[PDB]
Structures are given as structure tokens and as C-alpha cells.
Design a protein around this ligand. Structure first.
Ligand SMILES: [Mg+2]
Ligand SMILES: [Mg+2]
Ligand SMILES: [Mg+2]
Ligand SMILES: [Mg+2]
Ligand SMILES: [Mg+2]
Ligand SMILES: [Mg+2]
Ligand SMILES: [Mg+2]
Ligand SMILES: [Mg+2]
Ligand SMILES: [Mg+2]
Ligand SMILES: [Mg+2]
Ligand SMILES: [Mg+2]
Ligand SMILES: [Mg+2]
Ligand SMILES: [Mg+2]
Ligand SMILES: [Mg+2]
Ligand SMILES: [Mg+2]
Ligand SMILES: [Mg+2]
Ligand SMILES: [Mg+2]
Ligand SMILES: [Mg+2]
Ligand SMILES: [Mg+2]
Lengths: 118, 82, 148, 138, 118
RNA sequence: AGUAUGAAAAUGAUUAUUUUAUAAGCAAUCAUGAAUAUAUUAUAUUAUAUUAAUGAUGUACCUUUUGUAUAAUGGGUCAGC
RNA sequence: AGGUAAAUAAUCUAAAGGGAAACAGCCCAGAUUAAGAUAUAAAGUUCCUAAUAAAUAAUAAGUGAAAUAAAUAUUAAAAU
RNA sequence: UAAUAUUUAAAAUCAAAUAUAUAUAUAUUUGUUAAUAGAUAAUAUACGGAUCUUAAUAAUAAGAAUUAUUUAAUUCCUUGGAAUAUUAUAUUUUAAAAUAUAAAUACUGAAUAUCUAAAUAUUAUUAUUACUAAUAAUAAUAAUAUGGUAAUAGAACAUUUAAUGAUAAUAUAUAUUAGUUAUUAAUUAAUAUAUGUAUUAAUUAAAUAGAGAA
């Protein structure tokens, strides 16, 4: 019909970009957590520097942040597998897999955890 | 403590809920920088749009004027009137 | 300021020489390299609105390096306007007919920018299967290089 | 033998002294004519005096003519800008005057991308040569 | 930094940067800045406090703002005039209305009066 | 279908300047040599104007459409209405 | 089925710009006007064509190099 | 270690890494085949094209432009530092060796963002000018906003007529060319043609008030 010339693989450059994006997302989360921790420290009664130093850093309480922190639910880039950085689970593909770059707004969308065996 | 939150990706193409969230966050345009007090709610909000946003924790916030001043380039000259 | 001065030497066409016997670049790479020279992209005075490229003499083109089975299998094509008159010739066949020089030339042509200047640039490139050629005298040569 | 071929020197306005580019400004107006109201006001308002005080190297003529009001300005190079200040008010007229003063007389002209400097000095370093390059080509 | 061979030469060029825009000049040149200056008026003089590189035919001093002690490079403002007026015509491909986008940007003209070693 | 006047355009011939006989496509825009013309401050290493070297960019306009370079509608050009 | 009917989101409609060779709807990004120094997005970096250097493996078919063609067969390689 | 019959797996198992008490245990995370054939139609080969797979002897020199996993020299500790190596340069010493320096921020890439100026509107601060001065006009500073069909809203200009109306052949009107003012307009200069000269400037009132689209 109408030619949408989009390849089934990604170029190395694309892959690298994807990786970078993933890393950035992780970093954002990390930063958020750090901020929360330092706020907690300040509330308790410490300085900024002191808070930064502290061995026992506080985990976040809010559900979403906690979930993000868990690597079971939301892996970090170094943890993540090759097969999940550049492919998603498609319920109706051959091999039940599909290049992430096919997913509508893949540059914004985050999607790490494919199914366990698929 | 304060978050320095930047909109690093355009809202164009992003679902309207997410757009709304971003608007609430006080982020008007791409590349726009906001300094938000750190409380859990704000953090939660940021989490939702994490893929659009670049964040970093800082000691103190900055008023827009201050930010502008910081931005300004060095005019490599000193005028003398005669 | 910088552009002001005697600019005659800049826009002088140098003759370069490449001995394909003594060059280990494979065909395509070599062609690409030559293309740049022809265009004149190597010189800082280049501007796209100007043919300012140098002359390239290729010699010993018989010893050019081609990889894989391309000598046998790589097919050059030519079509008249007339349907059914598609000529498809293998590289070896072409070589037998015209020479390795032709091969090289084709590659260079392909490389080059597709505009008026192209043909001139192509013609600047002078290729010879063996060693001997009529340009031996005019290749650029310095006085300090004369130890040999 | 050495023979001289004639030439002349080129003036560089700012290198030694600096002559001020604008020389005369003629405020032209009309008593009758609503278009010339702002100009009239300007003429009235001691602003002109102030301007004169500020910039004594440039002279202000004040003509009376029946048409629209003008600010014809005369520059060192010879050229003359002329701005018709039809229906403007005092402040706008003043702004126009300022603009006129600021400009050198030179004609307007399209600049290309990044054409900044304009010299008549031979390059300090030479023009590149293929034979005198640090790196030979191949 | 031994700055004798710059001192001794007669021809000398400088690469000063106004707002990070580099301009490469000798004495007597006219630099056309693509903006309107408010600090300087006509007839004023600017001492350049950012000069990336001073150079003779064969030697060149360099550095991120090299000391004002070493050189004297001062430009006088000659003109504040605009570059010629243009009406680029903006429109789509089956829409009769047009948006005339006018353009008459402003220029400041300098003259490099002094360019010497100190 | 009044009388004067008429350097309004389309259209024809001719002359000048310039470009053009190895080059391919809305004929423009931007870059950019060269040639010519004018200029009573070109002092010039000058400024403007004209001009299809050369390079890059560039699917006419309207209508109607989910959508038009479309091989969908409409228009030979200009002047008046 | 470039089919049809609704659901959710985006874009197009009414959106120019960069990429996808060319491209309404894809990937990024929303043109007030310039200017062009600094960050860059998606995409790329032998030449055409703006920009590249590395590391470890595998491939010898031009497979492949921006639109992956199936069962199956042959040959090899690992693991038990 | 040969032959032997399956399987193409990190679930289990092993290895490595991260988080919890911590030289261990617990929990999580990652790591398991490749070629060839099968293969195919009609204007013309069809990765967009050139073309790309490397080699001693020799290059101040090429070594994938494919596929998979990565990096921004390589290794360790926690963006940094160190070491190692490489390249380049300088100086000394006998084409080498020693010392010091630099490079390691890959780069391109939009009309994106910033910077750099300009315009407009709004919000908040000003400064100057002039007797709803709590205003207006202009200029600053900070911020936000300025794609757009159907459509809504606001503001201007050209043309012609009516009311009021100086002026003048050195004037005017129209035309051509070159200037000027952020420029559908007007104005300046030169030139040509009228004309004893504006329904002229400006404010109102109105319109047979603007045409590449029938
Ligand atoms: Mg397509
Ligand atoms: Mg349409
Ligand atoms: Mg149109
Ligand atoms: Mg189209
Ligand atoms: Mg017709
Ligand atoms: Mg349908
Ligand atoms: Mg419609
Ligand atoms: Mg578009
Ligand atoms: Mg929209
Ligand atoms: Mg916009
Ligand atoms: Mg192939
Ligand atoms: Mg294919
Ligand atoms: Mg075919
Ligand atoms: Mg390709
Ligand atoms: Mg912008
Ligand atoms: Mg608008
Ligand atoms: Mg009508
Ligand atoms: Mg008409
Ligand atoms: Mg029209």
C-alpha cells in the first residue's frame, strides 16, 4: 500500500541513543530519590553537606518512587538485557517480539520489563 | 533543598494527561528551567514525566532574574565615552 | 583580511601521483580518496561554486586490489534507450576489454558530485594499467626530495 | 631600474582621529498641516536645544515648507538620508532624529552570513599554498 | 610567556570575541557587529577585554582572555545602521492569505584603531 | 460611437549590455566569480544597477477535498467592469 | 485488503523546520523578526553529503549494507 | 580421550553484578548457535548511487561501508583521581634515550533551547517628557506569550465623494529611475509631461472603497 520505510532492526547509533536515554531516565529517578533523602535529613535536623555525607540514606515512602527504585519492576540500564533495550513484547508478531523503535513515541515512552518468558 | 527541573523533550506528541502534569509542574516550554521545593508530592509528579524532564538537586533556588544574569554572555569590551 | 593577498598558488592545479602497486588501499577506498582530491576538498580555499581540484595520475592500475569474488561476480551495466539492450559485463570482462583504469574511473565518477563540473573532474584523473605514462615529468616534485 | 606607479591613500575614519559622520540635520515642518503637528511640538519643546547642546559638531537647520514634515540629514561621505515624519508625535520624531544621527551616511545593503570584517590590509599570514603547506597532500 | 616575537613584528592580527562571536582583525579594519549596541554611542571607544589570539606571520599568543596587560586593542564605534529591508513572503500551498514577514536587522560598525603589544 | 491628450499593459520588429552551441526539469531564492553601465566626495583596494559562469536549495496558483506536482476544478495575456 | 465498524492516544485536517532516498498521517520538533557564538532532539559521520575514532566477537554469502520470505533440507558449532 | 544419541536451555544449574544483616546468607538482576539452499516474469542492473569483505615484501599511510555486544584512549578505586599506553610538540643528551607540556571534554545535526539584538501584547518594577499625572507618549529591566484552515475579536492603509481648509510655476499632479523611513504607504533627488494650479495636510461623515480566480 503506502510505503512506511522503517527497518526491523536499529542502527548502532540508534541503539546507543536508546541506551543513553535509558541511562538518563535512571539518573532522573536517582536524583529525585537523593533530593527526597536530603529533604528528610533537613527535616530531622542536619545540614545539606551532612545529609549528602550520611551513610544511612533514607528510602522514599511514596509508592511510585519506591516501585521505580525496585530493579524487579524498573531495571537500570546496566542491569537491563540487550533483548529488552531494543525489543518489546508484541502479542501478534512472529517471534512475539518487535523492535522498540516501532513503538509509537519510543523516544518518550519508557518500557523495560517485558514478560518473564516472552 | 531544591529540584532544578528542565523540560528536555517537547510535549508535542505526548498524551494529554502528561501534558497537564507538565503544566502543573510549572514547566511552560522546552528547555525551560524551574526550581521546585523538594517535597514528596513534587517528586511523585516528576516521576510521572521522568522521560520528558532532566532533574538535579541543588542547595538553593534562583529567582528568574538571577538565572538570566547567570546566562548572560561576557561582552568582551569596556566602553569609554570620549 | 585573511583572504587578501596573492592567491595564485592556492588555485594552482597540482599533479598528484598514486602508484597502485605501492598503495595498499582496495579499489573503492582508493577511488573515494581520489574523488576528494579531484573535487579539491583537501584544500582550505575550496568553495563549492568552483572547480579547484588537482590532477591525479594513477599508474600500475593492473595491481589494484579488489576483495572477495568481485573480479568475477561484480557486474557493470549499460543501457541504450532501446528495450532489450541491457549490457551487463563482469569486472574481469571490462578489464579485458578496456582495462583496470576504466574500472577505477567508473568508481571515481560514481563518487563525484553530480553536476556540470563532474565530467571535467573525471577527465582530470589520468589512469594507466602499467607503469609508463606521459605525465612523468609534471608530477609535483620538491628539491629536498632529490636524495634518491 | 625602479619606476613608480601612482596611487592614492584610502581614508580610515577612526584610526587616527574620528570625524563624526553626520554633519547637518534639517528639521522641516509646516505651520498648516495636521501631519506636521508632532514636528511642531518638537520644535517648540527645548528638546532641540538640548540636542544641540549634546552634539555641537552637527548643525540643525529649521526650514518652513508647505508639505509633510521631514528630517533630511547630511553625512560626511556625501549621501543624504531623508525621513518624512508624517503624523508622528514628539517622542517618535526624537527617536527618528536619534536614528539619523547614529547612522553613518552609507547606503543600506544586504549582508551575507558571517561577512563581518572589511579590511584593505594584506593578510598577515600568507595565502595558503599547496607547496608551502606543513602537511603535503598524500 | 616570552612575547618578544609579537613585539618585534610590524604586521599583527587579533581574534577578539564580542559575546563569544569571534572576529579576526588587524588595525584599520571595519568590524560589522550584527546587533545594536546600547553601552557605546557613536564616537565612543571600546577596549577589548576578551582576545582569544594575537598572531604574527609565524608566532601566535593564545589563551582564554589573555591578560589585558600584554596588549592594547581598542576599537572606535563609527555607525549604528540597519541592514537592508526585506519582505520574505510566508504562505502555505492552497491558502490565499500570506503573511509578509519583514526584516531590517541592526548593525553596529566598529573601526579597529589601535592594535599593538604593550 | 463627444473632443483633446496618452512613456498603461498585453503584443510585434529592431538596437545595446550581458549570458548562451557536453547541456535536462515551476525558470525563482540564496551563495558566488566575471563582464558592462551610471555616479560633480570612485580618496579606492569605491558604491549601486544590469546580466541563466558556477554551486546549493526549490513538485505553479486557485478551487474541492480524508488527501492534489497531480494525469481532479478553473484560467491564452493584458486593460476596464 | 491502502477493506469495514466502533474504543483508546498521537499526528494530519489547520503545521512550516530536521530525519525517514522521494513521503499528509512515521521518528523528533511547533516558524513574531533577524543574527549565527554555545547547548543540543530524531537521525547520521568513506565519497556523493554537514560530521569518526576505538574495542571484542561472528560472518565469505556481496549474506548483508532503512521495506528481514515459509515449511523443510544440507553443512558445520556448542551443550549434555 | 575417540565414538555414541538427543538438545539449541540461565527455568534449573554455574558464573558475574546490585540491594539487605554481611569474608556468609537472603532477595533481585544479566549471561546459551552460524552458514548454504529453498528464492521466481515480463521497458533497465536496482543497498538511493559509487561502492564496501585486505596482503607478507615497504610505505611519517589502507585493514568492513556487514552482523551482535560496547566505549569515547586502556585498567583500577569512588563526576573525580590515579596508573598504563598512544599521538603531537618542545628541550636536553647519544636516527634513538631522558625531562616537561597538551590531548583525552568524539563530531554533525532543526526555523528546538540559550546567547546576541529588533517588534508587538500582557503582568510586575522603573527613567524621561507634558498640567482618569492614579494619565498619556517614549525609553529601560525581569518574566510570559506571538504556526494556523473554518471561525471570533482588535487596529491600520489605498481609492472616491461631502463638511471645514492655509498655501503656490522655486508650486503641483502623474509617470520613470535611483535613494530614505521596519516600507499594500509615504517621502527625497534627477528626469518628462501637464496645469495659473489641489475637495491638498488633518478631523469627521459616508461609500458603485481594493480582484489571477465565477
Ligand atoms: Mg512513505
Ligand atoms: Mg488543504
Ligand atoms: Mg498561497
Ligand atoms: Mg504533495
Ligand atoms: Mg482549461
Ligand atoms: Mg479506511
Ligand atoms: Mg477540511
Ligand atoms: Mg511537517
Ligand atoms: Mg495540533
Ligand atoms: Mg511558535
Ligand atoms: Mg545485497
Ligand atoms: Mg532489503
Ligand atoms: Mg530489477
Ligand atoms: Mg542506504
Ligand atoms: Mg525560537
Ligand atoms: Mg497568530
Ligand atoms: Mg467594487
Ligand atoms: Mg484586473
Ligand atoms: Mg492577488
Amino acid at each position: 500500500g503506502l510505503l512506511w520505510k522503517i527497518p526491523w532492526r536499529m542502527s548502532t547509533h540508534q541503539k546507543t541513543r536508546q541506551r543513553e536515554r535509558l541511562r538518563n531516565v535512571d539518573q532522573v529517578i536517582k536524583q529525585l530519590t537523593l533530593g527526597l533523602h536530603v529533604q528528610r535529613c533537613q527535616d530531622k535536623g542536619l545540614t545539606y553537606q551532612e545529609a549528602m555525607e550520611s551513610k544511612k540514606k533514607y528510602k522514599p515512602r511514596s509508592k511510585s518512587l519506591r516501585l521505580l527504585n525496585k530493579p524487579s519492576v524498573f531495571p537500570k540500564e546496566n542491569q537491563m538485557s540487550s533483548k529488552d533495550k531494543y525489543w518489546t513484547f508484541d502479542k501478534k508478531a512472529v517471534g512475539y517480539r518487535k523492535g522498540i523503535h516501532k513503538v509509537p513515541k519510543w523516544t518518550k515512552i519508557s518500557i523495560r520489563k517485558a514478560p518473564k518468558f516472552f | 533543598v531544591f529540584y532544578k527541573v528542565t523540560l528536555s523533550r517537547s510535549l508535542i506528541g505526548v498524551p494529554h494527561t502528561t501534558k497537564s502534569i507538565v503544566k502543573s509542574l510549572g514547566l511552560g516550554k522546552r528547555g525551560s528551567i524551574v526550581y521546585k521545593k523538594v517535597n514528596p508530592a513534587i517528586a511523585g509528579s516528576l516521576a510521572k514525566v521522568k522521560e520528558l524532564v532532566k532533574v538535579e538537586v541543588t542547595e538553593h533556588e534562583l529567582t528568574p532574574s538571577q538565572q538570566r544574569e547567570l546566562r548572560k554572555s561576557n561582552p568582551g569590551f569596556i566602553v569609554e565615552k570620549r | 583580511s585573511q583572504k587578501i593577498g596573492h592567491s595564485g598558488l592556492a588555485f594552482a592545479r597540482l599533479w598528484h601521483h598514486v602508484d597502485v602497486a605501492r598503495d595498499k588501499r582496495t579499489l573503492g577506498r582508493l577511488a573515494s580518496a581520489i574523488a576528494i582530491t579531484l573535487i579539491g576538498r583537501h584544500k582550505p580555499v575550496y568553495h563549492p561554486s568552483q572547480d579547484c581540484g588537482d590532477y591525479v595520475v594513477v599508474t600500475n592500475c593492473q595491481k589494484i586490489r579488489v576483495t572477495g569474488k568481485k573480479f568475477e561476480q561484480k557486474t557493470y551495466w549499460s543501457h541504450s534507450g532501446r528495450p532489450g539492450q541491457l549490457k551487463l559485463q563482469t569486472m574481469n570482462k571490462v578489464v579485458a576489454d578496456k582495462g583496470f583504469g576504466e574500472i577505477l574511473k567508473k568508481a571515481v565518477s560514481g563518487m563525484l558530485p553530480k553536476n556540470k563540473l563532474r565530467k571535467q573532474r573525471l577527465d582530470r584523473l589520468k589512469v594507466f594499467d602499467g607503469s609508463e605514462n606521459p605525465y612523468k615529468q609534471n608530477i609535483t616534485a620538491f628539491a629536498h626530495e632529490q636524495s634518491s | 631600474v625602479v619606476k613608480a606607479i601612482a596611487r592614492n591613500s584610502i581614508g580610515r575614519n577612526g584610526v587616527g582621529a574620528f570625524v563624526f559622520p553626520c554633519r547637518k540635520i534639517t528639521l522641516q515642518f509646516c505651520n498648516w498641516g495636521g501631519s506636521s503637528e508632532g514636528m511642531r511640538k518638537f520644535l517648540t519643546s527645548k528638546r532641540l536645544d538640548k540636542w544641540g547642546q549634546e552634539f555641537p559638531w552637527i548643525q540643525f537647520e529649521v526650514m518652513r515648507k508647505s508639505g509633510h514634515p521631514l528630517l533630511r540629514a547630511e553625512y560626511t561621505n556625501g549621501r543624504e538620508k531623508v525621513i518624512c515624519v508624517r503624523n508622528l508625535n514628539i517622542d517618535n520624531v526624537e527617536n527618528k532624529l536619534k536614528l539619523l544621527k547614529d547612522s553613518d551616511g552609507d547606503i543600506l545593503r544586504r549582508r551575507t552570513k558571517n561577512d563581518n570584517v572589511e579590511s584593505l590590509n594584506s593578510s598577515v599570514r600568507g595565502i595558503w599554498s599547496p607547496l608551502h603547506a606543513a602537511k603535503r597532500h598524500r | 610567556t616570552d612575547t618578544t616575537p609579537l613585539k618585534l613584528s610590524n604586521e599583527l592580527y587579533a581574534i577578539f570575541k564580542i559575546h563569544n562571536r569571534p572576529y579576526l582583525v588587524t588595525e584599520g579594519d571595519r568590524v560589522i557587529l550584527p546587533f545594536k549596541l546600547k553601552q557605546a554611542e557613536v564616537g565612543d571607544i571600546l577596549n577589548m577585554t576578551d582576545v582569544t589570539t594575537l598572531g604574527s606571520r609565524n608566532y601566535k599568543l593564545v589563551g582564554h582572555p589573555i591578560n589585558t596587560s600584554l596588549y592594547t586593542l581598542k576599537a572606535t564605534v563609527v555607525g549604528k545602521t540597519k541592514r537592508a529591508f526585506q519582505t520574505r513572503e510566508v504562505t502555505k500551498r492552497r491558502n490565499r492569505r500570506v503573511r509578509h514577514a519583514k526584516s531590517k536587522g541592526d548593525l553596529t560598525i566598529l573601526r579597529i584603531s589601535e592594535l599593538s603589544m604593550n
